[PDB]
Design a protein around this ligand. Structure first.
Ligand SMILES: COc1ccc(-c2c(S(C)(=O)=O)ccc(C(=O)c3cnn(C(C)(C)C)c3O)c2C)cc1
Ligand SMILES: COc1ccc(-c2c(S(C)(=O)=O)ccc(C(=O)c3cnn(C(C)(C)C)c3O)c2C)cc1
Ligand SMILES: [Fe+3]
Ligand SMILES: [Fe+3]
Ligand SMILES: [Fe+3]
Ligand SMILES: [Fe+3]
Lengths: 342, 343
């Protein structure tokens, strides 16, 4: 686990910022199909002339959908052309932002944006931006006084989707893990970035999972050994492969996501055949009805106390890059290890 | 004017959109605007550069396209320049080759010379012409083509299980597509159609010219700033499609069902309905549709007193103030809502 960082603390995942072709429509999609609700907005009517942001939320999970407002936006434009719709930033909520940044800077990290504070009638938030793998960044968020719904400069949603209230709740709670795919031979250095610059440790296809000291933030890093390489080809470099969202009841979550029209990967019925006979001879017993798990196409993986339940959406875009995961944990910490093979 | 010797522009065949995320765009138009998945072309069918989701409602066909690879020059530039928007407006035609011949000789730029595609379900001949801005027209001439859409396009690769639980919007056919032009460019843009395709000026009753095929099944309004048209041009990066109007035979049911899906439309002052009610008193047309429900739904009314139309606009389809949609219903009336600016 290494030494306990003397200063600073990464509390949790604060938000995930997506740079997409059409933020409005991306926001419509994640709300309707994945159970998110509109939280806040920033764009032409709030005085924001370069970038639009639609902020949506479910449980603790905050996704931010961004688009350029102007033709020939260099940085957002290049990224859009390069990656397609995908993750730009992984935000962490922290204690002592200034020290985390000092430390990261000393150790070699590139500071994209030096610490800054933004305030309203609701209080102050301190921010800083660092560069991780590929074009992916981390925004550090340190709330001082704050009482606001999301962040300073973001107004109430400009819009409303009247269908949202009529669709069933998906009950997704919090971000469990966010995976970063790397080019050939860049897994060590991508992960070393966290070990050195942020004082993470190794928590736990070629993979390595890094985690903050208290292990509230988990970030798997993969390299090809290939699915990963396909990712890289279509992403044109390193980036987020999947986001895992945790639920406390995956049967209800997947039933409601499926009712909303979300599609998941196919699982052959022999998976369940094997799973049932494997389970007979073992310590662990799955609480969730096996007949319904199989109907729903949920995967199970188990150790000697616990078991995870997990399931993977179809890609969020036509490029074979980003997808989502829904996971439920029963005293287990592994990641789908067994199901990966089958 | 004179009927053109050879060729016919039967109908709007479909509208191709070039978009950041084809799959999510197809999701949006299906769920919110009532379209259904019709066909697909992408990695699974052997199309390696371009992905296409084809969706349909009544006779309206929208094609949603994205590049599959990093650094697509043409589609990448288009997307950075315009955002999500219309790339191509297909016309189904008779006698593709002579239409193209005629346009070639009167000076039109042929983006793609006539060519034929063949599927096991038949043959289709295509041609591509360049119109305003980056917008093209694809000519489609079908030779007993019996497939779901066009050769090379297969079954929709997937499903959206919510679609059948949502109510029918009953949109029938494209009524008109408007192109906004930069300052001083209406004349040029409209002229292209009179000379290269042998359209004529369409009359009825911001600057605008309506242009239309002989038979008047195709109507393309051309706008120019006086301003909203300039705002469009600012955010679009140049000329392009401002709005697509979709005809319905029952706008009350259409707009009730679109609002139930969560689509949003423009705000209409309640005094508009005060003054429409007052005016209709001394008017020789009488509106069939219940006025109190029209007001509830924020539908607009225009009437020359031989007939009338009913009209309503979506919010933008994107965050840039470029493209939006129109739902229209016609009752013996050929105008386009002119009186409603002023209302
Ligand atoms: C997109 O084609 C595929 C292939 C495998 C998975 C897949 C499967 S599957 C569906 O094939 O059975 C099982 C577990 C995990 C999963 O989340 C995993 C595996 N390693 N890690 C770590 C964190 C170590 C990277 C994960 O997070 C994954 C990604 C998902 C989609
Ligand atoms: C503020 O955003 C909007 C949206 C629609 C109009 C708007 C209005 S509204 C309310 O503002 O008055 C009335 C009719 C039409 C309409 O479709 C129209 C007018 N001319 N043509 C032609 C064919 C001549 C271009 C049309 O197609 C349109 C686009 C105006 C502003
Ligand atoms: Fe339910
Ligand atoms: Fe995972
Ligand atoms: Fe109804
Ligand atoms: Fe119109």
């Amino acid at each position: 686990k290494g030494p306990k960082p003397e200063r600073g603390r990464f509390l949790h995942f604060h938000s995930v910022t997506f740079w997409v072709g059409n933020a409005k429509q991306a926001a419509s999609f994640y709300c309707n199909k994945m159970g998110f609700e509109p939280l806040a907005y920033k764009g032409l009517e709030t005085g924001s002339r370069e970038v639009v942001s639609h902020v949506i939320k479910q449980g603790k999970i905050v996704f931010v959908l961004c688009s350029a407002l102007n033709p020939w936006n260099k940085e957002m434009g290049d990224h859009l052309v390069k990656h397609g719709d995908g993750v730009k930033d992984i935000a962490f909520e922290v204690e002592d932002c200034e020290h985390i940044v000092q430390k990261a800077r000393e150790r070699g990290a590139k500071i994209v944006r030096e610490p800054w504070v933004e305030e309203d009638k609701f209080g102050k938030v301190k921010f800083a931006v660092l560069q991780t793998y590929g074009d992916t960044t981390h925004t550090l968020v340190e709330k001082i006084n704050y009482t606001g719904r999301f962040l300073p400069g973001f107004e109430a949603p400009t819009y409303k989707d009247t269908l949202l209230p009529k669709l069933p709740s998906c009950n997704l709670e919090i971000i469990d893990h966010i995976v970063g795919n790397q080019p050939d031979q860049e897994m060590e250095s991508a992960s070393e970035w966290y070990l050195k610059n942020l004082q993470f440790h190794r928590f736990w296809l070629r993979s390595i999972v890094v985690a903050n000291y208290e292990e509230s933030i988990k970030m798997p890093i993969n390299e090809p050994a290939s699915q990963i390489q396909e990712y890289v080809d279509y992403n044109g470099g390193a980036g987020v492969q999947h986001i895992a969202l945790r639920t406390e009841d995956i049967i209800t979550t997947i039933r409601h996501l499926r009712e909303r029209g979300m599609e998941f990967l196919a699982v052959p019925s022999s998976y369940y055949r094997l799973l049932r006979e494997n389970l007979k001879t073992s310590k662990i017993q799955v609480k969730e009805n096996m007949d319904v798990l199989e109907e729903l196409k949920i995967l199970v993986d188990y150790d000697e106390k616990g078991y995870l339940l997990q399931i993977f959406t179809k890609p969020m875009q036509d490029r074979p890059t980003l997808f989502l995961e829904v996971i439920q944990r029963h005293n287990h910490q592994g990641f789908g290890a067994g199901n990966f093979n089958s």
